[PDB]
Amino acid sequence: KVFGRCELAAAMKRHGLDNYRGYSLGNWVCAAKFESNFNTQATNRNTDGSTDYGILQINSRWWCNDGRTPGSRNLCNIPCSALLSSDITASVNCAKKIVSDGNGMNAWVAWRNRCKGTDVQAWIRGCRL
Numbered sequence: 001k002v003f004g005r006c007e008l009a010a011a012m013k014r015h016g017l018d019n020y021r022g023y024s025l026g027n028w029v030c031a032a033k034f035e036s037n038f039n040t041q042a043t044n045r046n047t048d049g050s051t052d053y054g055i056l057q058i059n060s061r062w063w064c065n066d067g068r069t070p071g072s073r074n075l076c077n078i079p080c081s082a083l084l085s086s087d088i089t090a091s092v093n094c095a096k097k098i099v100s101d102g103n104g105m106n107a108w109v110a111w112r113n114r115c116k117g118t119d120v121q122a123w124i125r126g127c128r129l
């Protein structure tokens with residue numbers, strides 16, 4: 001499922017991501033924009049042989065299990081394919097552990113490179129929330 005901007009914002013707010021670890025809703029939305037383009041089915045292989053999965057491009061080396069990644073930890077205890085669902089629940093719960101793991105939203109290199117420090121509130125402009 002390809003979410004609309006305000007669609008994902010409302011879902012993320014409902015799952016308690018707004019202000020989680022102090023990161024406003026615009027940050028999480030911006031991150032989803034530049035990680036997946038709001039597409040829950042997005043997958044992307046990385047050079048170390050891991051893959052990133054779903055709306056927030058969560059990595060198979062540490063967080064979910066895809067059966068093919070050397071050194072998998074599966075810290076979210078979840079098949080990576082569950083992060084590709086139109087229900088964002090599993091993706092949201094896992095993002096909570098990742099952003100709590102020590103270096104904040106810097107884990108997300110599209111966030112870091114394209115959202116961090118910018119006018120992220122723009123990413124929820126016009127939304128009824």
